[PDB]
Amino acid sequence: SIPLGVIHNSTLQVSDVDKLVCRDKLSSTNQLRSVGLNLEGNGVATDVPSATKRWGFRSGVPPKVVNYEAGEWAENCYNLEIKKPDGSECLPAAPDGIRGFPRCRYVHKVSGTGPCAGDFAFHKEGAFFLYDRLASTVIYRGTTFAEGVVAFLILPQAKKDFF
Amino acid sequence: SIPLGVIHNSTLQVSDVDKLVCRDKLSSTNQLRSVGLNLEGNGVATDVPSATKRWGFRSGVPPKVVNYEAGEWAENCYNLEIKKPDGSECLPAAPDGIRGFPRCRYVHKVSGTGPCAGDFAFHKEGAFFLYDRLASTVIYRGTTFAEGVVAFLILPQAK
Amino acid sequence: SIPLGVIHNSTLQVSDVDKLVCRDKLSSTNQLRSVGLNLEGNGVATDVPSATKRWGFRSGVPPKVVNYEAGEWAENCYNLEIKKPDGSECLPAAPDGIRGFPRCRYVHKVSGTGPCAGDFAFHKEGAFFLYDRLASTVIYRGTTFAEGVVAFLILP
Amino acid sequence: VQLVQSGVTLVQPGGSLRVSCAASGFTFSSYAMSWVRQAPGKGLEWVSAISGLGGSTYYADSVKGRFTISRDNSKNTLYLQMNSLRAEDTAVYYCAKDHRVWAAGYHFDYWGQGALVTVSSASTKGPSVFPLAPSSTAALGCLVKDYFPEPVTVSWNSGALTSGVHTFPAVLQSSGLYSLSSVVTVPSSSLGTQTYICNVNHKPSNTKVDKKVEPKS
Amino acid sequence: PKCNPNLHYWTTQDEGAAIGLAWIPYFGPAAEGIYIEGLMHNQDGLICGLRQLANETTQALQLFLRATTELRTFSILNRKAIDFLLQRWGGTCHILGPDCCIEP
Amino acid sequence: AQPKCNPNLHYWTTQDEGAAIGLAWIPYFGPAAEGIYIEGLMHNQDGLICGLRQLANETTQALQLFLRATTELRTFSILNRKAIDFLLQRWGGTCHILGPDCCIEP
Amino acid sequence: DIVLTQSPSTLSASVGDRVTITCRASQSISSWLAWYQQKPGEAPKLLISDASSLESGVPSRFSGSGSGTEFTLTISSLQPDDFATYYCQQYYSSPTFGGGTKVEIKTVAAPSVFIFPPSDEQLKSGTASVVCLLNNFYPREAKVQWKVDNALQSGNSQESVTEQDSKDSTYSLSSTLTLSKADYEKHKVYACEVTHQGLSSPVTKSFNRGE
Ligand SMILES: *[C@@H]1O[C@H](CO)[C@@H](O[C@@H]2O[C@H](CO)[C@@H](O[C@@H]3O[C@H](CO[C@H]4O[C@H](CO)[C@@H](O)[C@H](O)[C@@H]4O[C@@H]4O[C@H](CO)[C@@H](O[C@@H]5O[C@H](CO)[C@H](O)[C@H](O)[C@H]5O)[C@H](O)[C@H]4NC(C)=O)[C@@H](O)[C@H](O[C@H]4O[C@H](CO)[C@@H](O)[C@H](O)[C@@H]4O[C@@H]4O[C@H](CO)[C@@H](O)[C@H](O)[C@H]4NC(C)=O)[C@@H]3O)[C@H](O)[C@H]2NC(C)=O)[C@H](O)[C@H]1NC(C)=O
Ligand SMILES: *[C@@H]1O[C@H](CO)[C@@H](O[C@@H]2O[C@H](CO)[C@@H](O[C@@H]3O[C@H](CO[C@H]4O[C@H](CO)[C@@H](O)[C@H](O)[C@@H]4O[C@@H]4O[C@H](CO)[C@@H](O[C@@H]5O[C@H](CO)[C@H](O)[C@H](O)[C@H]5O)[C@H](O)[C@H]4NC(C)=O)[C@@H](O)[C@H](O[C@H]4O[C@H](CO)[C@@H](O)[C@H](O)[C@@H]4O[C@@H]4O[C@H](CO)[C@@H](O)[C@H](O)[C@H]4NC(C)=O)[C@@H]3O)[C@H](O)[C@H]2NC(C)=O)[C@H](O)[C@H]1NC(C)=O
Ligand SMILES: *[C@@H]1O[C@H](CO)[C@@H](O[C@@H]2O[C@H](CO)[C@@H](O[C@@H]3O[C@H](CO[C@H]4O[C@H](CO)[C@@H](O)[C@H](O)[C@@H]4O[C@@H]4O[C@H](CO)[C@@H](O)[C@H](O)[C@H]4NC(C)=O)[C@@H](O)[C@H](O[C@H]4O[C@H](CO)[C@@H](O)[C@H](O)[C@@H]4O[C@@H]4O[C@H](CO)[C@@H](O)[C@H](O)[C@H]4NC(C)=O)[C@@H]3O)[C@H](O)[C@H]2NC(C)=O)[C@H](O)[C@H]1NC(C)=O
Ligand SMILES: *[C@@H]1O[C@H](CO[C@@H]2O[C@@H](C)[C@@H](O)[C@@H](O)[C@@H]2O)[C@@H](O[C@@H]2O[C@H](CO)[C@@H](O)[C@H](O)[C@H]2NC(C)=O)[C@H](O)[C@H]1NC(C)=O
Ligand SMILES: *[C@@H]1O[C@H](CO)[C@@H](O)[C@H](O)[C@H]1NC(C)=O
Ligand SMILES: *[C@@H]1O[C@H](CO)[C@@H](O)[C@H](O)[C@H]1NC(C)=O
Q1: What is d(CA B143, CA B82) in angstroms, rounded to the nearest whole number?
Q2: Counting C-beta atoms within 10 Å of the first and last residue's C-beta, which end of chain A has fewer, N or C?
Q3: Which Cys-Cys disulfides exist here (chain B)?
Q4: What is the DSSP string of E8-56?
């Protein structure tokens, strides 16, 4: 089961699947929210050379996309134009309904030649590539993105801490 | 949230979200069904000159599609083939799985040249463009459509 | 009223829509599962000539795709490359996200000319065409598939 | 096509109050209503809105917590239930009807007379009348102090002197007690031979006092 | 506001008519002919009120369509069924309570 | 002594009921896709912000196995499925009064 | 959210004079705008809606124009009934009313200055209030400062302005200075300074305590 966080009065704990607590009250589906959090903001140095190390190309694995409703302002964002020595495009075109990251204070352009072994590019650490309300495991050409991860939490009704 | 009407007996009333009535019974998912209603019933003019004025082109807004299970027979329906002086098509091609309106008594075909100030065409009044069980905010080329809006109601079928 | 089977005592009992059984317990969504079953289990002829006769071309019917979580190892699988006398392609290309069948002991490849009067190719008996966790009513070009049917069960 | 609000109301801090907006002369359910409040000396402020059907309810960011709006199509009446009242919420509340759009937009052609709600919460007490002695044409007046709540009526000689009389609007004080001042201008020669008595009639506190103004050295 | 007291609606129903032999994909019905016809009449309230709800439903639906990133949203109906169940039994159900639907 | 986490969370999000007005939802006169989002800031709390970053990093492990198993290119039902499991665990089986699994108080 | 602003607050005008009010919204609300009219003690009355079309029963002289952010309400001829506060509401964003435009008529009159000491009965209660009276002065603009022993007093003064009188068309203003019994006795001299357009030199009226 995918982990699900719960919020308590000025305290946050995690809800186990097996344990059944009747104290928790879910009045409506609006309470549930998906929040993306960028990996850049927590605990890593933001620089172009280190970003290339984390990304890598792999084949035989189909891409998967998951939507995230909530997101965080990104200080650094990456736009990729990458081709091969023959001029072919390493990254696939962005599908319909997918847009660049909404909030980016600085967008670093990267245009360079690379070997590109494999059809799609995946993250070595496993961090998702943020997009506009869609998290994807593969990079898309000419689309501003951020490195981030998604969480699922339950929001309390009595007081509004989020949204 | 989204308004949801309930029908107790042969009358439609709406229940506010905050209040909770236990007498209301939802037996299965089949009770809930989405019904589109065409603008013809609302007494608006169905003439071609007024319909083209209500529609307008806009960019920067992505298209959205919503499904409706039930729909109403339309007396007047519109099919659009529209190009510019350079021959470019203002409206996009119909996506896979989308078809024209099933029941239309009259299909108006209007082919003329005009400027499009936007990538997609939206309804100024906000009415959805009817299709085959898919409602979209943008017009699609060469697909018969009707002007309508969608509602969601609860039906107490078995008791 | 899609049929839903339940296994309680390891014997099939029938759940009528009107009936309500409180003893059955649904703890989580993982309990529910969709299992496809191939026609090979039903004793149908597994040779290519019988399979191509069951399929036929039809227009005016849009294709539909349904997902199945579980599937069965197939002894025989069929891949179709079929064109017309003018060289046009009889079947459409496989859509994105759809892949060939993972487990096939024998993959029969038929490349030949055929009448292909229709937009899509459908099964006369009504059996679905197995695909990687996606069941489709129409055949796709150059994609290994199996003939099967889908069921929905509750796991205790 | 007329909307009727509640006449008068008075409350306490955090108190609960209901305002009823009556509607007649035209189809109610067809249109969507809304509430608009006007603070004294301040511009109009939108309170809450409800759709013609009643399924959708709308509240302001400040008003969403403590206010609740409801309407009944059968009675053609709009009820705004007010909870957790504050001093900032003291305003005349208006209810109106849609000008043009049918259950779509919030335009307002026709407004109700308005309902007065005062959350100041102060014990009702009689006003203290202090006369203002003239000087040296001569000006004299009476000062009303520490009165609650509104209104306060000022008349001279039981209305015998209506002319050259200026009743200034009420002013709120730091203590939360209103104060009013009224003056009159009369000839200097007529001051000695005539007597001027200001009448203050306060209904809630039942305080009616007539204070004559005499200038002495 | 002009209203049409007669509602002639075309729709498909899964449960209502199960005929058989029409499910086979080769011999199945044409795209134009799958729909069935129905007529609603002799009612002043139900027919006109339905048109009133859909005109107003567009307001809340538009904000939902803008919020969702899906090009095609089929989950609107499924979400309401969850909210209905969550409002009553989501929390602890107290016997003889206003929110709880339990009667001894 | 642990300033690796950022206690200030400035978040971009969408607006559910935020705007109660009815003259702007129409897409033609509506705001652009870039401008629909609303901003908010959470501050002066160390626990709530850091714990949020902690859960998603751990959730990524279990989430990856789900995306690989499902053939859907885009899965929007992950959050909605959780709401179904919430109700199924409590009221799915026979609910016994004064029981541990059943939520009923007399 | 979005809050529109009004350039004129108080505009002087006369009968039969063209009046133009400018209401500019911060964002682009396109053509959705309305103007309202509120008389003293009276409910607001709809003047115009959508900035193009006039409500039925509204005089034809009133008109408006402008698109997008810019809006102008224009009255070709002003009438006696036309004196009221005007607000502009835009329906695009959260409902927001303007600051309002009050319309008045503007000769010049000289303010009469009258200062009254606290009454003797008021002293026994322990509170002393000094009242400075301004009467029969238009235009409306005026400024009243309190000077106690040649010292400016800020925050301790309360003022009120009456409505224009129909007959003589003259406003009246009263300023009240409230102090404790002890503070009043310490300072011997209390003064009231009045600044007005009619008076070339601001006139000051002062009195001595206990005199
Ligand atoms: C839910 O159902 C609702 C009800 O049906 C529906 O609400 C409708 O919304 C429509 C939005 O577009 C609205 O259409 C507007 O109508 C304006 C009126 O124009 C008159 O003249 C037109 C040209 O001849 C006619 O075609 C119109 O029918 C209309 O004619 C009559 O007008 C009177 C009022 O003058 C009206 O009486 C009203 O009746 C109702 C009850 O029925 C109430 O009793 C009202 O109190 C009463 O006043 C009549 O009903 C009406 N019809 C008949 C047969 O008599 C029109 O002016 C609007 O155009 C402007 O906006 C559009 C937006 O697209 C712009 O494109 C356009 O350019 C206009 O802007 C101005 O254009 C001028 C051009 O010369 C220009 O000079 C100006 O500068 C410019 N203004 C600027 C830039 O600011 C618009 O078409 C319709 O009236 C509404 N329905 C009703 C009954 O009022 C709602 O949409 C539905 N919702 C959904 C989701 O489906
Ligand atoms: C959740 O959040 C977690 C925390 O952010 C995150 O955990 C991170 O996982 C990463 C896994 O990839 C991990 O990165 C690894 O780090 C290894 C350490 O090498 C250090 O030194 C190198 C040489 O100078 C540097 O280049 C490296 O950047 C790295 O930098 C230092 O790392 C240490 C160790 O963590 C760190 O010290 C730690 O500090 C904290 C306090 O800050 C505590 O005190 C700890 O006790 C202390 O250890 C330093 O701070 C840090 N420096 C600075 C300046 O901060 C590195 O060796 C790894 O690379 C190789 O190993 C992996 C193992 O498989 C290979 O995958 C990888 O590709 C490398 O292997 C070689 O790669 C070559 C290039 O591709 C290839 O050619 C070779 O073939 C291949 N080798 C072989 C045999 O094939 C790796 O970079 C990171 O450190 C973790 N975070 C932290 C803070 O430590 C987690 O991923 C998140 N999860 C999700 C789901 O979001
Ligand atoms: C669920 O599981 C079900 C059970 O397995 C399964 O049902 C199966 O459905 C298919 C439907 O096509 C059916 O196939 C039909 O079989 C008819 C029987 O034909 C005989 O003879 C042939 C030739 O020798 C044998 O190969 C057959 O096995 C069968 O032998 C036995 O016959 C007896 C009856 O006497 C049965 O009881 C036995 O079961 C059967 N088998 C065995 C092992 O004993 C066959 O006639 C059918 O052909 C006709 O109908 C088609 C319908 O589309 C036409 O397309 C076709 O052209 C034929 O129509 C006419 O036939 C005339 C005959 O001469 C011709 O002259 C005409 O020209 C021709 N056309 C016209 C227009 O007139 C058909 O092939 C299977 O038999 C059946 N399974 C079983 C076990 O019976 C379901 O599909 C499963 N569903 C799912 C979803 O999986
Ligand atoms: C969450 O809790 C705060 C504060 O509550 C106190 O501090 C907590 C950490 C915990 O120790 C509690 O047991 C304490 O009571 C709430 O803030 C107060 O809420 C009350 C109403 O419940 C209100 O009267 C006070 O003015 C608030 N301020 C205080 C007491 O500091 C808060 O309302 C709770 N809800 C959330 C999630 O914000
Ligand atoms: C059903 O609706 C009709 C409407 O005329 C009403 O008379 C009746 O009381 C309602 N209830 C029934 C028939 O149980
Ligand atoms: C299930 O069936 C088996 C068959 O051997 C039987 O022994 C058992 O009692 C049945 N019930 C349960 C709960 O296992």
Answers
A1: 12
A2: N
A3: 77-104, 90-116
A4: EEEE--TTT---SSS-STTTPPPTTTS-EEEEE-S-SHHHHHHHHHHHH
Residue A40 φ then ψ, to 5° = -60, -40
Closest to G3 in 3D by CA, of G19, G20, G27: G27
Give the tokens for residue A135: 């998290």
DSSP D208: E
Q: DSSP secondary structure string, F40-99? A: EEE-S-HHHHHHHHHHHHHHHHHHHHHHHH---SEE--HHHHHHHHHHHHHHSS---TT-
Instruction: Answer whether G69 touches F (CB < 8 Å).
Output: no
C-beta atoms surrounding G38 within 10 Å: 20
Please report residues of D whose CB lies closer than 8 A to that of F20.
49, 58-60
- Shortest CA distance to A60 belongs to which of F68, E91, G1, D217? F68
- The alpha-carbon gap from C41 to the nearest alpha carbon of chain A, in Å, equals 31
- What does the radius of gyration of chain E's CA atoms come to, in whole angstroms? 20
The span from the CA of B121 to the CA of F28, in Å, is 8
Structure tokens at C140: 């796709």
Q: Is D133 exposed, middle or buried (0-12, 13-18, 19+ CB in 10 A)?
A: middle
Residue D104 C-alpha, separation from nearest chain E C-alpha, in angstroms:
7
Min Cα separation F23/chain A (Å): 22
| Of the partner residues C28, C30, C97, the one whose CB lies closest to the CB of residue A62 | C97
Burial category of D216 from C-beta neighbours within 10 Å (exposed 0-12, middle 13-18, buried 19 and up)? exposed
The number of the ligand 1 atom at minimal distance from the alpha carbon of E56 is: 99
Ordered alpha helix ranges (H), chain B = 48-54
Contact E28 C56 (CB under 8 A): no
The DSSP letter of residue C141 is: B
Residue D76, phi then psi, degrees to nearest 5: 55, 40
Subunit contact A29:E92, Cβ cutoff 8 A:
no
On whether any CB of chain B is under 8 Å from the CB of E42, the answer is no
Ligand having the closest approach to the CA of A155:
4
C-alpha neighbours within 13 Å on the C-beta side of residue G96: 21
Question: Which segments within B11-145 are labelled E, that is strand?
Answer: 12-14, 32-38, 55-58, 65-66, 70-72, 74-83, 104-113, 120-123, 128-130, 135-136
